[PDB]
Amino acid sequence: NQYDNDVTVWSPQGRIHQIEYAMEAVKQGSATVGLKSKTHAVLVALKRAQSELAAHQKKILHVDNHIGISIAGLTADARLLCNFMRQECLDSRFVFDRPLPVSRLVSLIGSKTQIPTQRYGRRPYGVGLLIAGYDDMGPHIFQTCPSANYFDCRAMSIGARSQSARTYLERHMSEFMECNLNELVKHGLRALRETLPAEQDLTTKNVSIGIVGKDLEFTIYDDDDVSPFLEGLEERPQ
Amino acid sequence: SVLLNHKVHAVIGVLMDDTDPLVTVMKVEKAPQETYADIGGLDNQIQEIKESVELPLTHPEYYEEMGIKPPKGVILYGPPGTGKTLLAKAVANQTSATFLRVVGSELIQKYLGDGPKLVRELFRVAEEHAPSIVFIDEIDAIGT
Amino acid sequence: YDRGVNTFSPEGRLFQVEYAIEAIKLGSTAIGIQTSEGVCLAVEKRITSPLMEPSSIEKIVEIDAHIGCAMSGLIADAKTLIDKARVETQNHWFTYNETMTVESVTQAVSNLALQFGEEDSRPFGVALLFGGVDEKGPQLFHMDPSGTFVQCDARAIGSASEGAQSSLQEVYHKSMTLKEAIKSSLIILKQVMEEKLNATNIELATVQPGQNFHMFTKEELEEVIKDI
Amino acid sequence: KGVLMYGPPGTGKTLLARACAAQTKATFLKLAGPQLVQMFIGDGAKLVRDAFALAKEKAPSIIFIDELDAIGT
Amino acid sequence: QIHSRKMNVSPDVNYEELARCTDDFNGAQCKAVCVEAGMIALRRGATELTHEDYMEGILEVQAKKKANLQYYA
Amino acid sequence: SYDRAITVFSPDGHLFQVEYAQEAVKKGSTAVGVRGRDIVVLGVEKKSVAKLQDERTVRKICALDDNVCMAFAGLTADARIVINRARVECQSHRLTVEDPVTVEYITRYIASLKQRYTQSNGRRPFGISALIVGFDFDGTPRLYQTDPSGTYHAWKANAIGRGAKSVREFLEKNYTDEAIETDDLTIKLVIKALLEVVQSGGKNIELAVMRRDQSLKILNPEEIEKYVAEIEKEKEENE
Amino acid sequence: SDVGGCKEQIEKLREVVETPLLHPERFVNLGIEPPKGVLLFGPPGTGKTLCARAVANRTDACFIRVIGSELVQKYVGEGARMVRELFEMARTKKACLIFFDEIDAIGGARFDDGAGGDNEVQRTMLELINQLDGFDPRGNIKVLMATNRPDTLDPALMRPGRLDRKIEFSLPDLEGRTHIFKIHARSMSVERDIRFELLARLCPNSTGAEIRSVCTEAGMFAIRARRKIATEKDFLEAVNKVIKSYAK
């Protein structure tokens, strides 16, 4: 098939299938989650292991004292976009000393994600981004994709083994909105527990969380900081 | 050939074989002509090729009975016209076996596995009349 | 399929990065090990001709007094990244007037490697291991050509990387003394490089919080070469 | 006269055709499109013509063309 | 339901929850899922497969398990 | 992927298109180089001047600076371009910069240059390997091999061109622990290594010597017969 | 025991071919007619086919082994008819076991965008894949598949009616590599004090066909030395023949 090339070429169907190839590249394994409430927003990304003598890789980054993100792949474009968000927040503080609202920041990131898709000489983005933030309008969860779209969501999950998480989130969207911080992170971790493989139970060594809210900056929690959030998790009935 | 009665077609004799398709022409059934005495001075290769492929086809025990199992194949290299085909015909002359030379790019058959068939037939008709010394001229084509 | 990195596979993989992953194997074996006592590195020195200068295969190198590097792959493209790692310490000296952590050197080399897909050059066929005793203690880090980086308590690259890694997982923990880590690394190295060990085909270096000095532990490491 | 089952694989097209072949007690003429990608210059046309002639000879018969796309390109 | 009744099954089966777990399948794949669940029930030593067998079947039949996420290029 | 382009790995990590540099170098001239006890000595063969032709313009060895030169196995146009880069580079660096130039520095620069020309499309990396010998590196002479791939290394004695095949064994066959004493055994071993050249008699076997302190000195035809006779007598007495 | 360490895989094979002919007391009573066919895929051309031979030995079954080449001739159309002939002539036998190799070249799906070429595959291959029978529609016949490349195989082969199990292999593990040399200690006359335990470790990630080649290469070591028996040094440097020269 000739039409599997530069985003400048449309397939006869009227599609750019390389964007779908980037999207499927995003879907390649362990789970990540994001969801917000009236008070807080939360994202979680499990740190995948490599060996018994190599460290788990962190997948959560801080952007500003009201916004942070989570990242899926080998971070080729994800971390650069995170740094661009950080510089944009610095510019916002340079111009009006304000942490700019989440949605109007993510709109420019969506435009930037679209920019390569029209021209040659630049591969499409191979990562999907989750975002948790709060601003002078409210708390928000956003997510962006190689297709350059941005979504404000009550819950979201990118990767594989996460359709169970997605269904749990689709079920408890009825609760996510009104929950507090602890209840919200409990809901997210329950969605993640829905992603458990057959031979495993959730360990502290991989679960890593980022949290923001109306009275809390975006911060990152690990192992024994995650455990105060892992309590209240769904049990193992049958 | 089979000798048959003219009227009742009964088999009533047998007679000399003077036929069979062009594969016999592809094969060099006769032991080659050049000998080890024609390869002037290139004598270490005589030892190498004797150790490798000359002994089995008149002394099978050296590769089947002496507590061991036979080998498969031996590669020769050097500039064209330096004795490769000459030494091959010399070693094949040192035995009564048939010599089967094929250049690597000559067996290009069209449909799937038919080139493998064109290689397979040479081994199939090998012990159908005596073992053989196979020689791929220019192995280069087959792997890189 | 794989003419350029401008497009991925119909699976979404690049048909380039895994090529760098096996191109890791074109070089000799290499090991890095972090302990609470420091970080050590080793590379097989297996020569092309012993009448070449035997130190000229600089696959075990010092970056600075508290930081060292090991490589797997071609020496040419490794030289650029190693030079970047060395020059960033002097840049820190001339700008911040103090020393630079191995984490930020790792980050800078990662961003230099991450240029071939978002400029507007080409992928680097080398995997790097750094070992530092920096402002955050002992710290071993690993980069693959992809431009990402990970902390490692130990790591193996180069030829026979994965067998050495799997066998080392049986004999390692986060906080032993670096000397017994060296011994356990060598008892596996002896079988990983070719057959037998000497300066023609082995090389190793180490740095410790008690030694911000002379990473080039060669020809004084001779005793543990003959301890094994 | 003509019915095209269409849809992605694994849905039931061949099974439905075989079930209709079953319940009718009629004569079933199953073939695959790839079976008619034969090499010889005109042999595919001869095969199609002869198959339709056989179908006419068998009168209450149902021809099935599986993977018409292989020859309906 | 079709393949389960043909194979005979343990009564405790949520076919509806099976369909929910069979997200975005085609028919043939689930047709396979039934027989392979019966095979694992043979491995489970049960006299007839139950919902656990279909779960443990779909858990493997779904995909080739693909690559590893947090390090994909 | 395939060998159709430099800038992509083979599906096994190979770079066939780049790795063609070996036979790119191999089909040029033939040269050998050593560092003696103090003085480096180099030799070249395969001139084969066609009557009206000359080897004077062929210039297999050119002296870049009073303490650095090289040998140029490969295509002659790229060799001349390397002449014009390296010679002017070292001259200007020593003439203007606070630090002097060394053979190590020029080898580094050439390696970086070739690696950088490997670093882009539409730019053909130089198809020549070279022995670069220098008299000054903290005052000590030394030798380097450089390859089109951008890799560089130091050697005690090496050969390039069509002579790069045999000499790799040949040196290991007769290199003593003693670095070839003074200029006598240094030039003698140069002649021994260049004996793999067509006739070894000095008819078209030439050489030059740099004494680690003075510039490149030529074993000119009025004297090279003496070294040729030395080599021949040494080979005759040991028979 | 001729299998080199992969006895795990041949045993899970026998659960789906050997067990449902020799031990039918658990299949149909528990619901499903005994299965008859499985696929294999592992290291490069290493040992794969031989598993089928061991099964057909203990099954006491007539054995047939096929490659794509034997379904191909300059004469076209008949290549498909050869599979039909093969199944019929096997069923004329008192039940038979048939095996296919490089099933990727046979069980590989349609390639329309080739626009011609060596196109005989497209005429023949489905007559295997679509005329092939599985656990249910199969007569008194046992079938086994193998190929080194499973990623290209048609899902129709993957799905039932073609396959009743799939099995994966890898390069022989350390226990496997030791056991291969244990097997080949029978294949020659040697000074049988060998440290095969160390020979299998001197081999890094490697195959088992090369193990056979190395055993015959120790035979070569005896022959070049004209020695009446092989020795441990012959085994060591025969291993290094691959390990050094095939990996230097």
Ligand SMILES: Nc1ncnc2c1ncn2[C@@H]1O[C@H](COP(=O)(O)OP(=O)(O)O)[C@@H](O)[C@H]1O
């Ligand atoms: N040892 C030798 N004795 C006699 N003739 C030789 C020898 N080596 C090469 N030749 C000459 O070279 C040719 C054979 O060399 P060979 O390498 O077999 O050629 P090719 O590469 O065409 O097969 C013959 O024409 C022969 O005249």
Ligand SMILES: Nc1ncnc2c1ncn2[C@@H]1O[C@H](COP(=O)(O)OP(=O)(O)O)[C@@H](O)[C@H]1O
């Ligand atoms: N709803 C269903 N119920 C029972 N069997 C089904 C169903 N859907 C599909 N199948 C099985 O899967 C196959 C569907 O694929 P088919 O119609 O053969 O087209 P293709 O050959 O393109 O896959 C059928 O042959 C049938 O055996």
Ligand SMILES: Nc1ncnc2c1ncn2[C@@H]1O[C@H](COP(=O)(O)OP(=O)(O)O)[C@@H](O)[C@H]1O
């Ligand atoms: N470990 C081993 N044990 C037994 N036979 C082996 C082993 N490794 C390789 N073989 C060889 O593999 C050959 C055929 O199997 P194989 O080529 O793997 O089948 P396939 O073509 O399906 O890969 C046999 O001739 C056998 O000698």
